[PDB]
Amino acid sequence: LYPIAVLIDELRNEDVQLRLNSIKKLSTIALALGVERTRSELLPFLTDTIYDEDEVLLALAEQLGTFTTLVGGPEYVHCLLPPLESLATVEETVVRDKAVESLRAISHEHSPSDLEAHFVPLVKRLAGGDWFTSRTSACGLFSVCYPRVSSAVKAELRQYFRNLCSDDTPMVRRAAASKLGEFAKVLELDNVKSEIIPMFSNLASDEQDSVRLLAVEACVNIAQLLPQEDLEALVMPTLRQAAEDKSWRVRYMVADKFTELQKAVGPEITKTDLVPAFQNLMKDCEAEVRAAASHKVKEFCENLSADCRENVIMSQILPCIKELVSDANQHVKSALASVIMGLSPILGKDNTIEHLLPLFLAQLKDECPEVRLNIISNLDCVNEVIGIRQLSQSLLPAIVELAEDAKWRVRLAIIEYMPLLAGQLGVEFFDEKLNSLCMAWLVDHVYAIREAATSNLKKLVEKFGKEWAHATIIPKVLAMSGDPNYLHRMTTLFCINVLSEVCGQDITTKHMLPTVLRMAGDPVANVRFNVAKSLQKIGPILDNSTLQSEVKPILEKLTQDQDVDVKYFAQEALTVLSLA
């Protein structure tokens, strides 16, 4: 009672935060007031209340959408229309968008009679207003009332939308172009061809290139409604004029939506017209258009016609890819590299080895870190298709040479790829060449690389067994415990932690346990409390005798040290192990 009155008074307050909180709790106010009172004196207070900031008006617009049950159901929802009509006219685009969204949401509760009597007049009022914000908001209210009105109202709505697309303020046309695809989905096919196609063609040749770059999405959404035979005569000429557009933004949009365009227009139209369009987009004089077109290379080549997929790829797309590899722009190479590897299964093993492999090598030895990072990220795609007997001769030297490169992200990528790679090569050959690489990663000057090599060591041990670790890996790990740089001693501790669970009980007891116990006397408190953490982590696998006999005295001795951190991390090591 009293808090609700506080909220009601709080709608009119000088504090923005308190007013916003009061508006966000409008549901309780409406519940207390009742349906009749909200319809009669609360909502009319919310129609003239447009004096607030962005957050307050946005919250009010969001709340009004879920109000249809609080005003008396779907019969009195028309009384929710004045506040939202007032909110759709405001200057803020987020508030306008939320008001439009709420009008659409409550437009599904209008009965068709109530629709044509209250909401269709609201759409006409918004689309015929003197403020272009009202018309910008009206552009998005034609797809929610069209399929549920009569033929005459449908014709009037189509005429009003056509007037919206032919407006004089660029914002209204730019908003109608966005909703042209949505409006075309609820139309009739004959009506689509007769009315939307002229509208789409007129918006696609607009004087403003910000309205032209939405005709691309309009074309994508329209080509999915027309038959395959009507695309050549109605949609395809405008798409061709849009791919070859003078503004780089329209060409960028065409390149960005090229995969959806290829899906929509059907494979024959792709192979006939879009393939030259794709080639011309990948040879564009604009770096961003080239990057956008190269982003879609593998997807477009994958969704091509299966009758001549690899043939058309090798005949047309491959030279342009060979040119894009040698490009002078960092983003184009970095975008083509992350997608080129997926082209390998389509072409097959022989075509891959003949053509793609030099490109892969040129991109692995590229001066740009992103190209190499992406190539290593996607190397598995070609590794699966050309096998392991053919990979090593051309690819293994690149990985070995690049596992020691400058950028540590590339080294990390190679570390992640290393377990899967070495799994197919067996223990016998990996030990000779790559074991030294995996051990030199542990000493790397970047903690991320040391942790990555630690996890990779776990993976290698779990792949190859425990005997190989006990013979060739573990001694090398303990060799770092005498490092003068204490970061590497912590690295040895981390390796022992990640190897304890996987290398085996008796081996942990006999080989790496003595070093963990001994390192408790390190004159750096960091290593001391990391020894405490390591003992806590390793405890569960040890047997009772070794634990209580050797670990307990050493861990307890850490509880007399001067450093607070060692004390705390030994105290919450005795209790978790139930040694207290």
Binding site: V16, Y447, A448, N485, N526, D565
Partner: protein, 299 residues
């Protein structure tokens, strides 16, 4: 009892902050109170033992600070020493400063957050800390407790008595470390004097004292740093607060070193970041890290 659950809360707060998510007003209040309680006992020169990882300006860049923690290790495993500028023109200044303060509270013997020039009520209002704080909290409360917590941050740090780590530079009125000890740092930075110059100064190429290009503080030449080092018996003066293209720079014939650890500062200079690692062998190992992984309207 209370200490255990408080440490659990601190650990949870650090874990949540690591996910780029901010804290609540009450949590920031308690954190600032505890941090002031901890920092009131730290002297004007905080004697910190090796090994240490001296970092410089972060300037609110939170993902970049996470990259820093990915290069040199995480706390409390790696002993850090930050020198100023955790706020002010970072897009996530509140999260950066909250994470650093939480690390200092939870691992008081592992972190040492010094005081910079962008840590004061005057600077934090104009260069995007007050505005960011209002955007993220809606009130000037947590900003206020952050700024009066900034009062108790130490002015300097002495690594093993041989590395002198301060955010700014040497002072005309200060000759020895005891003069810095005599200063009263329980106040906002003044517009003049020793305390302002300890955070606003800059090393230059010309000898002797000079006028700062920023109008605040002075500049010191090679001979000033040489005299300071030979008088205080220490081998290196570490500092920050100056943008350096390579991340770190050596000045005055390897007498002082600038460590600026905020990469891609101004988003158009393209500078890298660097941190300085020390072991008991006192070897200076400088790590570097540049990355951290047309506009929409014109796209």
């Amino acid at each position: 009892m209370d200490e255990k659950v408080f440490t659990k809360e601190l650990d949870q707060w650090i874990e949540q902050l690591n996910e780029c998510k901010q804290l609540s007003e009450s949590q920031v209040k308690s954190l600032c109170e505890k941090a002031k309680e901890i920092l009131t006992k730290e002297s004007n020169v905080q004697e910190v033992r090796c090994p240490v990882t001296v970092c410089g300006d972060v300037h609110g860049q939170f993902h970049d600070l996470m990259e820093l923690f990915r290069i040199g290790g995480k706390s409390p495993d790696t002993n850090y020493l930050f020198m100023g500028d955790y706020v002010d023109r970072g897009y996530y200044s509140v999260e950066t400063v909250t994470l650093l303060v939480a690390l200092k509270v939870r691992y008081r013997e592992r972190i040492t957050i010094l005081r910079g020039n962008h840590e004061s009520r005057q600077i934090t209002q104009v260069y995007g800390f007050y505005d960011e704080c209002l955007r993220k909290y809606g009130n000037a409360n947590v900003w206020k407790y952050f700024t009066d917590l900034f009062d108790y941050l130490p002015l300097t740090a002495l690594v093993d008595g041989q590395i002198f780590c301060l955010h700014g530079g040497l002072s005309p009125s200060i000759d020895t470390l005891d003069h810095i000890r005599a200063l009263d740092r329980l106040q906002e930075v003044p517009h003049e004097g020793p305390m302002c110059d300890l955070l606003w100064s800059d090393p230059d190429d010309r000898g002797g004292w000079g006028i700062s290009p920023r109008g605040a503080g002075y500049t010191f030449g090679q001979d000033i740093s040489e005299t300071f080092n030979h008088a205080n018996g220490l081998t290196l003066v570490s500092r920050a607060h100056q943008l350096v293209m390579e991340g770190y720079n050596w000045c005055h014939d390897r007498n002082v070193v600038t460590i600026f650890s905020a990469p891609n500062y101004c988003y158009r200079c393209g500078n890298q970041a660097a941190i300085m690692e020390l072991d008991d062998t006192l070897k200076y190992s400088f790590l570097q890290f540049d990355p951290a992984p047309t506009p929409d309207y014109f796209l």
